[PDB]
């Protein structure tokens, strides 16, 4: 009887949420940016193509130094590039072939990957001999690890296919905080610029905002119709964008706590695999399954260029921290630097 | 300056790194990766036990050809996002408990979703209709009827292209080929030449299963080669 009245009371609470969200919708981002001058057609050319990977390049991450990359492939290799001189700085052989993510530590000392073995493997670059050794295995997740992003040398947040994000302590190797709330597989993260909040789009058409210290879900954002595959914060950390299998990208505002703009074309019926922002946040780059990466005017929803180039779906995308490039991996095994 | 020296050490390190990726390219192209994908009741555990030398990897070789078979055990039941990792595998070994009538539409619907997936519409399936000895006992008992869970079985006769083992009742052969034809009815209704289905009838005590997969992987590679020539 109490369980019967709780679900309808829960439906009562979201009735206030819908009232509160429409109470603050006095305008539209499509209405305020009507008089903004267009960014114009953005011509981008493949500056470098980084070859070396035997199988699908399934993830990728730039360094803070804006020069080195990392790439993970399903062949079980993990290669640190030097996109300036297209050289392979390292090529870490992974224990498990099936790796679904990778990160480069912001200090640049470490690399972490993991995938279908449910573990996150920290790799140390600055070793004694000069090789790369597995610093730690972070075991404790009950599903495939979908995305792990570093905070410091000693903390890492990991997504999982078991509807759970977690914050680890690399020194000790156990989860310090566990984030629970999602209904389906968690597919992506993005840390805040200030590294106090992070979002997580799962396979339940719903992205949540988390407080890393507090360890609890602050706000949940819905608006998508299918699995959310990519997510990134806006460069000021007051907003983020999400891709999905419903072939749309959405801009959310955290303070307004509702959807702000949608990024769809009638010609697009393929899901978004990756999303990223330029340094100013004026562009929204987005990979697709149709092998392209459409470039969006993030304040006018107008497609403003296309990064065609890839023979297979674009797995990963990434704008460099200085903003002077974008890298795009694919299942054709070729990273491509654009500019 | 020593600016040349740093660049000289970089091309030196890339030269060394690149010559392992060539050695690693040889072994990677050599080995055939397989995805073993069944049910808890299917009895995948006994096919792996018949393979002789998070995600359980089993190695075996036949005629000096290496095979790597992955049992993705450790993920949850929702398999629409890790199934995409295996779009490059040589074949999907599907194991079905042919004796378990209640769950066969689960197996058929799973088979249909793999067949018609965007990212698996070029991966051939080596279907293994396991637990044939249990199906034989179930049919001869006459307690549980296939017609209960499949009303199309009322009007079905053993196909002419049939190779029953001696001492098999005509009853057991109808049931065997009806179950198998339900899978082949899905396989023949789409796919349009990119991928094929290889049904086999496997017991728990059967031994020639590594050979069957070696044979069916050879057929998969042959047909891959001779579609680039537009011959098939």
């Amino acid at each position, epitope marked *: 009887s109490e369980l019967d009245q709780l679900r309808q009371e829960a439906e009562q609470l979201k009735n206030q949420i819908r009232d509160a969200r429409k109470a603050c919708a006095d305008a539209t981002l499509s209405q305020i940016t009507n008089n903004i001058d267009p960014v114009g057609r953005i011509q981008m050319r493949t500056r470098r193509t980084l070859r070396g990977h035997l199988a699908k390049i399934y993830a990728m991450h730039w360094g803070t130094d804006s020069r080195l990359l990392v790439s993970a492939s399903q062949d079980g290799k993990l290669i640190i590039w030097d996109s300036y001189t297209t050289n392979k700085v390292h090529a870490i052989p992974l224990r498990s072939s099936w790796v679904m993510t990778c990160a480069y530590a912001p200090s640049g000392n470490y690399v972490a990957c993991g995938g279908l073995d449910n573990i996150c493997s920290i790799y140390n670059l600055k070793t004694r001999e000069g090789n790369v050794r597995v610093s730690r295995e972070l075991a404790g997740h009950t599903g495939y690890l979908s995305c792990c992003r570093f905070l410091d040398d000693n903390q890492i947040v990991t997504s999982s296919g078991d509807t759970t994000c977690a914050l680890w302590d690399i020194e000790t190797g156990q989860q310090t905080t566990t984030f629970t709330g999602h209904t389906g597989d968690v597919m992506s993260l993005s840390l805040a610029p200030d590294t106090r909040l992070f979002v997580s789009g799962a396979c339940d058409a719903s992205a949540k905002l988390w407080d890393v210290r507090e360890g609890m879900c602050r706000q949940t954002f819905t608006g998508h*119709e299918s699995d959310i595959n990519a997510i990134c914060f806006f460069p000021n950390g007051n907003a983020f964008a999400t891709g999905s299998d419903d072939a749309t990208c959405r801009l959310f505002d955290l303070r307004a706590d509702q959807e702000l703009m949608t990024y769809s074309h009638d010609n697009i019926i393929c*899901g978004i695999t990756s999303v990223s922002f330029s340094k100013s946040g004026r562009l929204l780059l987005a990979g697709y399954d149709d092998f392209n990466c459409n470039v969006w005017d993030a304040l006018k929803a107008d497609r403003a260029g296309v990064l065609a180039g890839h023979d297979n779906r674009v797995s990963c995308l990434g704008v460099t921290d200085d903003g002077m490039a974008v890298a795009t991996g694919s299942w054709d095994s070729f990273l491509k630097i654009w500019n | 300056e020593d600016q040349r020296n740093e660049e000289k050490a970089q091309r030196e390190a890339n030269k060394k790194i690149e010559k392992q990726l060539q050695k690693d390219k040889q072994v990677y192209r050599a080995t055939h990766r397989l995805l073993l994908l069944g049910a808890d009741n299917s009895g995948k555990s006994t096919i792996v036990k018949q393979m002789r030398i998070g995600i359980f990897e089993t190695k075996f070789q036949v005629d000096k050809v290496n095979f790597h078979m992955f049992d993705v055990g450790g993920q949850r039941d929702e398999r629409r996002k890790w199934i995409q990792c295996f779009n490059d595998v040589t074949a999907i070994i599907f194991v079905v408990d042919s004796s378990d009538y209640n769950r066969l539409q689960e197996a058929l619907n799973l088979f249909k979703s793999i067949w018609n997936n965007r990212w698996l519409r070029t991966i051939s399936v080596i279907l293994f209709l396991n637990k044939q000895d249990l199906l034989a006992e179930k049919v001869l008992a006459g307690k549980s009827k296939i017609e209960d869970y499949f009303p199309e079985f009322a009007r079905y006769t053993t196909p002419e292209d049939a190779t029953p083992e001696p001492g098999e009742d005509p009853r057991v052969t109808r049931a065997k080929y009806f179950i198998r034809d339900e899978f082949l009815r899905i396989s023949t209704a789409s796919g349009d030449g990119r991928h094929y289905c290889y049904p086999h009838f496997t017991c728990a005590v059967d031994t020639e299963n590594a050979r069957r997969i070696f044979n069916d992987c050879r057929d998969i590679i042959q047909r891959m080669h001779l579609r680039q020539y537009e011959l098939l």
Partner: nanobody
Amino acid sequence: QVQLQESGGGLVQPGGSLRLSCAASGFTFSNYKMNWVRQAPGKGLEWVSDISQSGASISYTGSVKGRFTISRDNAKNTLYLQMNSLKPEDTAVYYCARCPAPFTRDCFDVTSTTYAYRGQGTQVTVSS
């Protein structure tokens, strides 16, 4: 938000009639294949029937074929399941499930334990 509110179902004598209705909102109902799944007491979820985006690729499970009809109305954004000549075998909770992604001929984990795009369900019970 993706809402699939179910309707119909209740205590029906054997060989009775029923019509289950799920109302869909927060997505374009015409882009997805809609399914019906049920969970018998003491058993796991089982798939009942599906229907393509257009409404021309209907399939049923063996147990209920010719005995149930599934229909959809894209204008109304609703999905129907006509049930007649019921059995004591048919007592279960009927959930209106939606394919995970749009414009696909494949549905991958509609009958899974924790699925996002499924209804809360209606108890259809058949007895005296």
